[PDB]
Symmetry: C8
Subunit: 63 residues, 8 copies
């Protein structure tokens, strides 16, 4: 079972124009300001790459 | 049969046949086109990636509705 | 958990009169036209044999 | 205790006693007769196959309703 | 997952007055007439001992 | 963390202290007394069997309601 | 699956003023009087430390 | 991916950066401050403990609502 009470993922792009790290947490999209928080959540949710051009489509599907 | 922590159910699909349609995906029941290979590799970390002929996409869309 | 979002199976017969490959996907019966698609779905759902004479009964139970 | 991907719950049943009734199955709560051994072998890939005496089938049907 | 679609158990007593084999199948109590059927269901559900004097209490809890 | 096929959730309980109350059980939220050791051994195949002091039974009943 | 029908945990403090052992059992807070019962439930639920000053906050979250 | 018997979902969080806020937790969707290290070590037996910058706590609260 998911003891952490969190479902979702971190996402970022390694392309030319970064949007920082963001996350979907329990169906809510948030921005992450600090790398400490990124590494903290990487202990409990996956962290994947999403290009800047694709974030809008993924946002729609995660609604 | 392991816990899904990502809150994402679905799969990537493409064809290796004639008439590529690029990469697409079903993400929580929503069909999307994928524009960049980076995003394909990212979602391949959390959902399966399978082959679907161009001729079969419409039928699969009707089941994934 | 079923990360793929698909529940069901492919079915076909090896008997004298083929009906091609079909599948039940999330309770919806579809025909599959291309072997590429069959092999794609064999990565994520089972593929079993069902004789032509038995498909009608299985259809009823999968309603 | 592993994930069931097939969307099928049930079992095949037959008797090895006197008075065979062939192979039958419960598929998602629906009782069916099976006409061909090919179908028996196919469903044996995804659901259990057990023995039930002819005299016990009616009782099992009432529980599998 | 429970692919068989059956939840329950077989029960019998080895005491002086047998009541045969019975079973709870999906919350329904039935008698089992033939040992072939007992061994068939032992492939998919547990088989435990319950004394004749205790069957009434277990019936109440399985209602 | 394995599949429960028995359709029974609960546990047997007894005390090894002063003032035995015999063996009892919670079976799907119903508290019962057990009359025969055979039944204790049978249910020990499918549900846990733990020790509860006589003085604590009332509190546990209120949680298992 | 949780065959025992119990979800929760035992809690106590090793600090200067003990409150005994308590437990949350299926969302119900109870006191435990006897160590036999503590060891019995330690067979089936976790047993953690909670300081006396923190029990009120944990009670609120377990409501 | 193992059974959670504790009836608790959530996590402990603290920062190692400038401006500590101590240890806090989400417990079944309720945010709490933790006053004693004993309680931190106790909950570390049953829920994860992760790092969250002070600047990110407000955003995480909005998702954990």
């Amino acid at each position: 079972e998911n003891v952490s009470g969190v479902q979702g993922f971190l996402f970022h792009t390694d392309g030319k124009e970064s949007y920082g790290y963001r996350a979907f947490i329990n169906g809510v999209e948030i921005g992450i300001k600090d790398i400490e928080t990124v590494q903290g959540f990487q202990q409990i949710i996956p962290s994947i790459n999403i290009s800047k051009s694709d974030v809008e489509a993924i946002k729609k599907a995660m609604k």
